[PDB]
Amino acid sequence: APNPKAFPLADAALTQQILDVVQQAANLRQLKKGANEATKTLNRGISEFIIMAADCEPIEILLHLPLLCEDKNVPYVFVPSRVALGRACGVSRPVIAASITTNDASAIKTQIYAVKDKIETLLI
Amino acid sequence: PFEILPESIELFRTLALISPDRLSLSETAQILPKIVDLKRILQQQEIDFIKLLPFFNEIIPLIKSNIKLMHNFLISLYSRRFPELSSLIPSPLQYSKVISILENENYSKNESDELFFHLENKAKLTREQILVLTMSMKTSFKNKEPLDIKTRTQILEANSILENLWKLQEDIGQYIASKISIIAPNVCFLVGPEIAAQLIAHAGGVLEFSRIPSCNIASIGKNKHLSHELHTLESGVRQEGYLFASDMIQKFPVSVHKQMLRMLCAKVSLAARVDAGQKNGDRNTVLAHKWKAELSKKARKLSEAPSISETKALPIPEDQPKKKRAGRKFRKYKEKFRLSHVRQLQNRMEFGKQEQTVLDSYGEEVGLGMSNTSLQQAVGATSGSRRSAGNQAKLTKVMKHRISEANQQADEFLI
Amino acid sequence: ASVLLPQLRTGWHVDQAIVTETKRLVVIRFGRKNDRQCMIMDELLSSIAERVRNFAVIYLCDIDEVSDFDEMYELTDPMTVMFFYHNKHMMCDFGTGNNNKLNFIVDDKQEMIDILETIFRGARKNKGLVVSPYDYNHKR
Amino acid sequence: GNVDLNKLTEEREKLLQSQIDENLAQLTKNASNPIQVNKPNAATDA
Amino acid sequence: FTLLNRLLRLIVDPNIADYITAKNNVVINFKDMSHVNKYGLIRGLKFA
Amino acid sequence: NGPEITPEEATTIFSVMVEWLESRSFSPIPFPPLTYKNDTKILVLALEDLKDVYASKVRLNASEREELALIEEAYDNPHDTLNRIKKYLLTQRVFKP
Amino acid sequence: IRQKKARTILQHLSEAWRCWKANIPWDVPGMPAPIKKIIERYIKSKAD
Amino acid sequence: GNLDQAELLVTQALQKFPSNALLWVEQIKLFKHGNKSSLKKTIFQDALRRTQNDHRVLLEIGVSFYAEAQYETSLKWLERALKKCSRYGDTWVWLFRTYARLGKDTVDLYNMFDQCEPTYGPEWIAASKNCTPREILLRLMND
């Protein structure tokens, strides 16, 4: 079962949507995988929204990213499966953190925005 | 007392103006003994508070900024007297010390103690550094008595303030080190306490350190990279810098330093993150242990080379002629390896005649041979025997890629 | 090498070895264990054996311990090697004159391999003689 | 001739166990040799 | 190289000198044995 | 044990150089300008020297071939090559061993 | 199973020599002391 | 005093309208304060990318460099800005200041000063609002 501190966890459909978005971004180079890269993105400001893995053990290695997001007002979720996330990113190896980055002239801008909105809805 | 430090912070911030700093300097001067002394005293006094930090985490970046500003000011003052000095000596404290030494005077034209003072008084000055400094002096330093005595006085003042600031910073770092096993236990476990302090101090808080992404950590606490100073090492680590100096890296051989260093950085970062996450007095320190173990394992693996392989045999020499192929597609490839028609011609040498040689400076030996037609030979050269496109030396995949990269870099530079 | 190459105990064994390699060629080294030249040859062949493996095979014979094969060389008996395929003796003309056996040390591992290769080729063809690529004519 | 190692041999005989002998680490080509062989050969594949 | 570098600086644009210094400081190799050239010029660099 | 030249020695010898230069009144060699007058010719010369080695030989090994290819590239896209060279001079502080 | 052991030791002997040639240390871990010493001696002799 | 809030606001603005050079300028200014003193060059690069080397962004960068007291670089930046669009003002002022700081001299600038000023440029505009000359205005700005 998934971690309590990994919050907000997505729901299934939402998770799927997010992964699709990630995949799209990966194809368009508008994504960055990896805790450290996510952090970098956040620092820059380029992060549109952050996707983490709930099933990161030891969860602690993420649980700065959420804080960062909060302090930068970037929405964020955890999805459940790090394997799935990795696959979406385009990496066989299992991944914990990714960042869909900003770029006005993306084909997938609209889609990304939708996902962002959804993420925001979750937060409270 | 306990209460002062926000005032100190405020004072530090007020300095965050720009050079020229003159009445500002005077203000700056005032700020110095007022504040930069009391803090030291407080530090010296054990048991004043444990929640000084995160105000010491708030202040250290400010302090750093202040120091930088001071350094800049100093450089401004000195430039046009000794422009290259900044280039030659990076570290601001060190620079200040050098300046002081340079000003000192007495037998400084010949030799004080000139090249003695540097080594002892400006502690850090390494032989290489010193040599470069000397060279610079010989060329670029003007040594015509200072633009004014006033100017000299000002620079002295700057040095005094800057030095004091540096001392304060050092004290703070020491304090952090003393505390760290409570601050960032995991990091300490991974690396060592002094190193942790150095890293953490540089960052700001542990939160700051965490925020720093792994790749950056390596080059925290590097000696600012002077182009003239040699760099390459058998190690292949480019970063040097605090972490690299740790046991965890420096215990293994030089083959593994680079990879090991890289590993360390990421694990250090992870540790920092963990520390940030955990609330005071949890001091879990299990993840860090695991990481350390893993690091060790990795190192061991790197050290341990591959098994001797079964010395792969030659194939049974059988003489098969199976191929028989041809095809525009397949011809080309093979055209690269086939002797060309002009080479075939060359390989024929006319029989009687003293057959035509190109004296190439490296070796005259070379006979064209019956490539060049009789009449042609009698007159001059040929581009009919510059025939082929199908063997014009093309690059490798790797080489091509490299060239592309280079081109890209060039383009970037041009922008 | 001692541990690297396989060594033979008796003449019968040797004969069996010679017969029973159908596919590969068979270099026997007839030599007195404690000699310099023989030792050198063994060392050379140790290296070669692994390489040539899929086409040739190397064996050792203590000539004092196994005295069956003094038919091969009329009791000249220096520390030699001999070449075999389908239980036929294989004849490797160097300069030396002893087309039968190489009774001399070659130092170039690669060279050794090449000569072995040549003899293998000859054997496959059916030839009994084979001219070495190299000359020799020094090491008699 | 071979005298300087006799003592060493004796020492070895004295010290080692069977278990130790059994667990002698099959040695890795510390001067990464086969890689180099592969690489030169590939460069100068004729 | 330090002495050399500064000497060069008296006759080339410093960048060039720096480049030269860096080049004379490479990892040399030989059939599985390195060393690094922290000192002592490389004779075979075309400018050398 | 550090550089065998002690600082005094360096000072002596550096000084000797500098004074000599002063005496000769020497305009220092400037960085190859982005649009150098004798650029192209120089490049050509360089490439010829590089080639030299091969002018004889009839086969090439792989490294040699690569070198030749590079030379050709330089010749054929001269401008690009020049730019690359300039970049290297500026920056490249590190090198294939 | 001594033949196998002998074979292994041959490789070790070779490999230390190789290392020496390269100019790299032969810091093999699990090897027992006296064997190691013997190997070192051998290498020294070879060098001589 | 509140800087984090400002930063947040800037970020929001960027998210909403990424291209708007003034937001970028503001961000740059914030960075120059010296909270990070890092992620600085990268940020600048980003700004340049988004603003297609916007006239004003370059100027801002130059100013920041001026503040940091690396003066040749600042001058270069200012020159670039000028090239991008000379009609804008504050840039000129900045250049003049840089020159003053350095040993360089103003004759060339004066010669090239034939082109317009209060067309655009914030400080310059403000000064104008506060007259009819141009060199006088420049002098005032310098002061």
Domain spans of chain A?
1-124
User: Which phi and psi angles does D3 have, rounded to 5°?
Assistant: -80, -35
Asked if B49 contacts B2 with a C-beta cutoff of 8 angstroms, the reply is yes
Asked if C132 contacts C103 with a C-beta cutoff of 8 angstroms, the reply is no
Residues 1-46 of D with CB under 8 A from B: 26-30, 32, 34-35
User: Which phi and psi angles does C62 have, rounded to 5°?
Assistant: -75, 110
Q: Does E32 touch chain D (CB under 8 A)?
A: yes
Asked if C86 contacts C55 with a C-beta cutoff of 8 angstroms, the reply is no
Q: Which residue has the tokens 């060629």?
A: C25
CA distance F79 to chain B (A): 11
Asked if C39 contacts C90 with a C-beta cutoff of 8 angstroms, the reply is no
- The total number of structural domains that make up chain C: 1
Asked if C104 contacts C113 with a C-beta cutoff of 8 angstroms, the reply is no
Separation CA B243–CA B247 (nearest Å) = 9
CATH of the domain at C78: 3.40.30.10
Q: What is the DSSP string of B85-153?
A: HHHH---HHHHHHHHHHHHH-SSTTT-SSHHHHHHHHTTT--HHHHHHHHHHHHHT---SSPS-HHHHH
CATH classification (class only), A1-124: alpha beta
Give the type of residue at A11.
D
Q: Is B338 exposed, middle or buried (0-12, 13-18, 19+ CB in 10 A)?
A: middle
Asked if A41 contacts A65 with a C-beta cutoff of 8 angstroms, the reply is no
Separation CA C75–CA C80 (nearest Å) = 12
Resolution in A: 3.7
Asked if F86 contacts F34 with a C-beta cutoff of 8 angstroms, the reply is yes
Q: Is A117 exposed, middle or buried (0-12, 13-18, 19+ CB in 10 A)?
A: exposed
Structural domain of C117: 1-140
Q: Does C4 touch chain G (CB under 8 A)?
A: yes
> How far apart, in Å, are the Cα atoms of A88 and each of A3, A20, A92, A98, B128?
21, 7, 9, 10, 52
Interacting residues of B400 by C-beta distance below 8 A, sequence separation 6+: none
Question: Do C and H count as touching (3 or more CB pairs closer than 8 A)?
Answer: no
Separation CA B259–CA B240 (nearest Å) = 13
Q: Answer whether E6 sits within 8 Å of F18, measured CB to CB.
A: no
3-state SS, residue H20: coil
Q: Does B234 touch chain E (CB under 8 A)?
A: yes
Q: Please tell me the number of Cα atoms within 13 Å of F68 on its side-chain side.
A: 17
List helix spans (H) across E1-44: 2-9, 14-24
Q: Answer whether H18 sits within 8 Å of A104, measured CB to CB.
A: yes
Rg of chain A (C-alpha set): 13
Residues A22, A25, A29: CA angle, nearest 5 degrees: 135
Chain F residues closer than 8 Å to E3 by CB: 3, 5, 10, 13-14
Identify the sign of the CA torsion B270, B272, B276, B280.
positive
Separation CA B22–CA B24 (nearest Å) = 5
Q: Does F90 touch chain D (CB under 8 A)?
A: no
Separation CA H33–CA B30 (nearest Å) = 22
Separation CA G4–CA F79 (nearest Å) = 64
Separation CA F32–CA F81 (nearest Å) = 14
Q: Does D43 touch chain F (CB under 8 A)?
A: yes
Q: Is B103 exposed, middle or buried (0-12, 13-18, 19+ CB in 10 A)?
A: middle
3-state SS, residue C128: coil
Chain F residues closer than 8 Å to E6 by CB: 14
> How far apart, in Å, are the Cα atoms of C76 and each of A87, B147, D1, E41?
75, 101, 30, 60
Asked if G26 contacts G19 with a C-beta cutoff of 8 angstroms, the reply is yes
Chain G residues closer than 8 Å to D23 by CB: 30
- Burial D18-42, CB ≥16 within 10 A → b, else e: eeeeeebeebebbbebeeeeeeeee
